[PDB]
From a paper:
Spike (S) protein protrudes from the surface of the spherical virions and mediates virus entry into host cells. It consists of an ectodomain comprised of the S1 receptor-binding subunit and the S2 membrane fusion subunit, a transmembrane domain, and a short intracellular tail. The CTD directly engages the cellular receptor, human angiotensin-converting enzyme 2 (ACE2), and functions as the receptor-binding domain (RBD). Moreover, we captured an ensemble of cryo-EM structures of SARS-CoV-2 S trimer in complex with the Fab of 2H2 or 3C1 up to 3.8 Å resolution, revealing the MAb-triggered stepwise allosteric rearrangements of the S trimer to coordinate the binding of neutralizing antibodies targeting the SARS-CoV-2 RBD, also providing structural basis for MAbs 2H2 and 3C1 as noncompeting antibody cocktail.
The S-closed structure resembles the tightly closed ground prefusion state captured in our recent study. In the closed state, all three RBDs are in down conformation, whereas for the open state only a single RBD is in up position, which is thought to be less stable. Here, our structural data showed that binding of 3C1 or 2H2 MAbs could trigger dramatic conformational transitions of the S trimer (especially in the S1 subunit region) from the tightly closed ground prefusion state to the unstable, loosely packed open state with two or three RBDs up and released FP. Of note, compared with the S-closed state, the S-3C1-F1/S-2H2-F1 structures both exhibit an untwisting of the S1 subunit region, with the fusion peptide (FP) released.
Author numbering:
A (entry chain B): 729 to 1067
B (entry chain A): 923 to 1116
C (entry chain A): 389 to 437
D (entry chain A): 50 to 69, 77 to 247, 255 to 340
E (entry chain A): 535 to 620, 641 to 676, 689 to 728
F (entry chain C): 535 to 582
G (entry chain C): 971 to 1019
């Protein structure tokens, strides 16, 4: 659904703590403004892509404490108040099998100064002008955006997306979604003790697919990896000599005169600007991939969670009944109930 | 319904004339086209690592032995500006074409037909949509079926008449507290259970 | 401002016509034959009469 | 967007005046460059002495005005501790005419001299409001003294007015000296140490290498300027290149920490290299 | 030590912070470098000690403000630092100076990040509030209840796409 | 005037069209520039 | 921007002091060509996907 919000300081990345370089960099004018405009344009739409998927109803829905579901066990999908973040047991497995950065987007200067860790990826980017913006919708809230869409799915059926929340029993909800796929509703009540055992065993198979197999989340792991590697590639871009005699800005300022440094520093500025014009190109094409998936995820939220999907094999193999939203790192995981 | 629909068309006039930020999505398409064309003029004021940004200065100062050191810095600076600009246009054109394929999806399925896709053409049960001409885009007027006034009803899955379960073919089982009635899902029209 | 690690002085006497031959990338009876400077020569050349 | 030595906005500038018991012509630094601004009514600001040590041991600039010609001289001046130019004995037939010439004692080894056209300046005394505003930009980089003059009528009693004026270059002086300290001439009156001073005001602010935006009108006059180092509000104006910041958040840059002092650490050796060998 | 200065080690000039380190240089080694090839550590040539070079200008700066036509009072969000450098409040995104904490959770007017949104309301200044998720509704659910409309409306929803 | 020529004003050579303008230069100003930093206007040094 | 487009010409004409002025113009011209080409491929791959 979303990706890593990156705002690269092109004043600090091109000229790192230098006054003579910044006097030459401001001669280039609108180069650092047009790249920061594109990174801000990513930062607006990725908060918008998270807005269009997880927030499709203006009201937040919760489940009553009296649980009368007809044998269906929904304790694995509903959030747990015992955790400090209101998350289900499935949502706790989704946040743990994906490798992220450190806890919280606030890493202190004294944490990078008082302890210089050997090959620390997060501090070394931040001393190169690579700042990671936090998302607008936190994972504590995304677990409650999906909880509002899940409580409307369980209690109110599919009428909560087409207007106000209008309750219907889950025995009547499963009977009327069978009529959408062509199954007579008498099949449900003759096997209500059987389908509730087949469904709750399938929820137990989600635990065996996420805890044992950690490669099921490899699609969203690759989204984190292509964000983390490209930020780590951009540090490796500074070690290139750019056609000049050296790659370090502090060497040419200590060796050559400003008549002979503008031959050499402007090779470093062009090598660092083209690196940023490489990186912003790699981010906008990747953001077009995530937004096309977020528009697909918003399509699989409005049609597949908030309603009943008549689209054959669009929400997985089988006649689709309903789908359950689950909070995922920079994305969403659906639990498609299929016939 | 003809009074509820024609009053909703009058609400389109109050949403477009008073609020000018409703068209801000297509205003941003014009703005990202107009600013990037205006940014490309500002790209010419960059010195590109050379001694000046103007092509006419180096032609008036330096010899073609010393100008090819300096003009080829301007040519590379203006070409990399265009290769950045065409990059900014093709990624933006991939955004509009993905929205135009979405607009062609909301024209064939949502205007030319009836959309069974739930909440794809707006909130509510979608009936039809009206195409309207827009600057570099389209505006749809989605006719939706939204419930307004509701009541709490007592329900049941089936009914024992002679020891056999009776299930509705199309509709539900509701009751006002004394007698059980039959009606459909999206409207309460009580009938005799036959 | 800048200071250097391993300074080596290259002291010799040649003809006055061939002082410009002491440069990275030149030829002559001094440059091409016996006293050649490297392609990556980072140094200074001091000469006088 | 321009990048040169500028006076930053909302900065700490000086508070010096001339009155009948405060007389101030202090020694002021000029490390990077100074800005001048004076509200006057009686032409009390007469000029300056730009030098290194303000002595005959160095070469100094002396820009003055002796009410006839704008005198700009670069000589080896014998610097007096209190330069002034007074007007004497008004009581009958006033005429506002000078007697003494006390800006220096002697001048030798004169390298640059500029004498302007002769004019008649009205040195009369006024009361109440200040009717003249003389502002100057003083910087000496690459041996090229740039001056920028602007004169506009004001109506002021007190503290520097909230307004804007685009300063224009008058001349270009190739002085070729080092300027570290300077003073300012003032005029003295009495109805030679029992003299008094007329009402005057002048402001000194230090130039810094900052970045400005320059909004021009249809005629070419600058309407408003924005310093890029005031606050992150004004740095957004430098990034967006518009004085009207739209409703939103724009990432400008990082929180820059300027270095306090220069630290040099070299190996410790007292033996010289064998240059004689 | 522990201050952003303008160091000069064996002619190498730059801006950095000198701190002690556990790194032990080899006797032929003087300069320590990083992934970005810049000098991360030097060696003191006078006395035997090892000093790192930490780059200055740390901490991103966010600009939380309304339009210049409305007002000029601003709130500056300092990422990746505490409220030490500098109406002072600490958020989940960083130190927020210039915005008053308001417990009333409203709709998100200005998208900031880390679950925080701001607005310019009422003596008028920028307020800092937690982004509200919407009006919370409790669905009365049971095995024998259903809500079916006896009346409806026809609302024309306007969806605008390029 | 009003023809695409090869102008030369104070050594600045280029191809442009010379027309009259309502712009009034300051007495220390000679060259007028644009957003693209190229010379948009010059001043005739012989007659004002 | 160099004196020629061929890599084999500058290796046969100029010294490595004077070739790094010229070959690094060829490397930057060929890398930016590959930077343009991969940009043309990724946007086209986003169209096909």
């Amino acid at each position: 659904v979303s990706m890593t919000k990156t705002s690269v300081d092109c004043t600090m990345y091109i000229c790192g703590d230098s006054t003579e370089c910044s006097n030459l960099l401001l001669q280039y004018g609108s180069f650092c403004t047009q790249l920061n405009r594109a990174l801000t344009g990513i930062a607006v739409e990725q908060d918008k892509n998270t807005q269009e998927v997880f927030a499709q109803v203006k009201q937040i829905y919760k489940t009553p404490p009296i649980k009368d579901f007809g044998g269906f066990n929904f304790s694995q999908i509903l959030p747990d108040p015992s955790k400090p973040s209101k998350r289900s047991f499935i949502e706790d497995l989704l946040f743990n099998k994906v490798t992220l950065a450190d806890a919280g987007f606030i890493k202190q200067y004294g944490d990078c100064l008082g302890d210089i860790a050997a090959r620390d990826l997060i501090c070394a980017q931040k001393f190169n002008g690579l700042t990671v913006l936090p998302p607008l919708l936190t994972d504590e809230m995304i677990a409650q955006y999906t909880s509002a869409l899940l409580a409307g799915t369980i209690t109110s059926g599919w009428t909560f997306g087409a207007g106000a929340a209008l309750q219907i029993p889950f025995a009547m909800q499963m009977a009327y979604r069978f009529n959408g796929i062509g199954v007579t509703q008498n099949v449900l009540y003759e096997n209500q003790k059987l389908i509730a055992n087949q469904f709750n065993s399938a929820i137990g198979k989600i635990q065996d697919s996420l805890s044992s197999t950690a490669s099921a989340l490899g699609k969203l792991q690759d989204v984190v990896n292509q964000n983390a590697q490209a930020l780590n590639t951009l540090v490796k871009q500074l070690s290139s000599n750019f056609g000049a005699i050296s790659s370090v800005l502090n060497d040419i300022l200590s060796r050559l005169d400003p008549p002979e440094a503008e031959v050499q520093i402007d090779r470093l500025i062009t090598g660092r600007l083209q690196s940023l014009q490489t990186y912003v190109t790699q981010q906008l094409i990747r953001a077009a991939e995530i937004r096309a998936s977020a528009n697909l995820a918003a399509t699989k939220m409005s049609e597949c969670v908030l309603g009943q999907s008549k689209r054959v094999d669009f929400c997985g193999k089988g006649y689709h009944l309903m789908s359950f939203p689950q909070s995922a790192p920079h994305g969403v995981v659906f639990l498609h109930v299929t016939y | 319904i003809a009074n509820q629909f024609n009053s909703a068309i009058g609400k389109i006039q109050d949403s477009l004339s008073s609020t000018a930020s409703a068209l801000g999505k297509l205003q941003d398409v014009v703005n990202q086209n107009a600013q990037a064309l205006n940014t490309l003029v500002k790209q010419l004021s960059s010195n590109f690592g050379a001694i000046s940004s103007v092509l006419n200065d180096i032609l008036s100062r330096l010899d073609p032995p010393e100008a090819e050191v300096q003009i080829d810095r301007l040519i590379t600076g203006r070409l990399q500006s265009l290769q950045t600009y065409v990059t900014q246009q093709l990624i933006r054109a991939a955004e509009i074409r993905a929205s135009a394929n979405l607009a062609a999806t909301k024209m064939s399925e949502c205007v030319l037909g009836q959309s069974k896709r739930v909440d794809f053409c707006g909130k509510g049960y979608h009936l039809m949509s009206f195409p309207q001409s827009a600057p570099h885009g389209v505006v749809f007027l989605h006719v939706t079926y939204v419930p307004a006034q509701e009541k709490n009803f007592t329900t049941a899955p089936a009914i024992c008449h002679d020891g056999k379960a009776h299930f509705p073919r199309e509709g539900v089982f509701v009751s006002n507290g004394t007698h059980w009635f039959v009606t459909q899902r999206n409207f309460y029209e009580p009938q005799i259970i036959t | 401002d800048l200071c250097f690690t391993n300074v080596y002085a290259d002291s010799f006497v040649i003809r006055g016509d061939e002082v410009r031959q002491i440069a990275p990338g030149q030829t002559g009876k001094i440059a091409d034959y016996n006293y050649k400077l490297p392609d990556d020569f980072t140094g200074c050349v001091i000469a006088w009469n | 967007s321009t990048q040169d030595l500028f006076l930053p906005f909302f900065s700490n500038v000086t508070w010096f005046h001339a009155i009948h018991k405060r007389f101030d012509n202090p020694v002021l630094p000029f490390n990077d460059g100074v800005y001048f601004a004076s509200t006057e009514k009686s032409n009390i600001i007469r000029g300056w002495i730009f030098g290194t040590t303000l002595d005959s041991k160095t070469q100094s600039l002396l820009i003055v005005n002796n009410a006839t010609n704008v005198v700009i001289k670069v000589c080896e001046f014998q610097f007096c501790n209190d330069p002034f130019l007074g007007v004497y004995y008004h009581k009958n037939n006033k005429s506002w005419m000078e007697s003494e010439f006390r800006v220096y004692s002697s001048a030798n080894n004169c390298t640059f001299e500029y004498v302007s056209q002769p004019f008649l300046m009205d040195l009369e005394g006024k009361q109440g409001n200040f009717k003249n505003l003389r502002e100057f930009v003083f910087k000496n980089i690459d041996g090229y003294f740039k001056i920028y003059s602007k004169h506009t009528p004001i109506n002021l009693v007190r503290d520097l007015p909230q307004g804007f004026s685009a300063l224009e270059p008058l001349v270009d002086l190739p002085i070729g000296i080092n300027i570290t300290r300077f003073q300012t001439l003032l005029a003295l009156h009495r109805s030679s140490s029992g003299w008094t001073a007329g009402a005057a005001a002048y402001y000194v602010g230090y130039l810094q290498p900052r970045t400005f935006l320059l909004k021009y009108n249809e005629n070419g006059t600058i309407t408003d300027a924005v310093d890029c180092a005031l606050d992150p509000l004004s740095e957004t104006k430098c990034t967006l290149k518009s004085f009207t910041v739209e409703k939103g958040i724009y990432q400008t840059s990082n929180f820059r920490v300027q270095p306090t002092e220069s630290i040099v650490r070299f190996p410790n050796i007292t033996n010289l290299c064998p240059f004689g060998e | 030590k522990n201050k952003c200065v303008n160091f000069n080690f064996n002619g190498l000039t730059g801006t950095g912070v000198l701190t002690e380190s556990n790194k032990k240089f080899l006797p032929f080694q003087q300069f320590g470098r990083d992934i970005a090839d810049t000098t991360d550590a030097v060696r003191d040539p006078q006395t035997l000690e090892i000093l790192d070079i930490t780059p200055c200008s740390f901490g991103g700066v966010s600009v939380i403000t309304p339009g210049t036509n409305t007002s000029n009072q601003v709130a500056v969000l300092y990422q990746d630092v505490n409220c030490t450098e500098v109406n002072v409040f600490q958020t989940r995104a960083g130190c927020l100076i210039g915005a008053e904490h308001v417990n009333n959770s409203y709709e998100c007017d200005i998208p900031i990040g880390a679950g925080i949104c701001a607005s310019y309301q009422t003596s008028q200044s920028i307020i800092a509030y937690t982004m509200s998720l919407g009006a919370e509704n409790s669905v009365a659910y049971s095995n024998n209840s259903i809500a079916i409309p006896t009346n409806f409306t026809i609302s024309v929803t306007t969806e605008i796409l390029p």
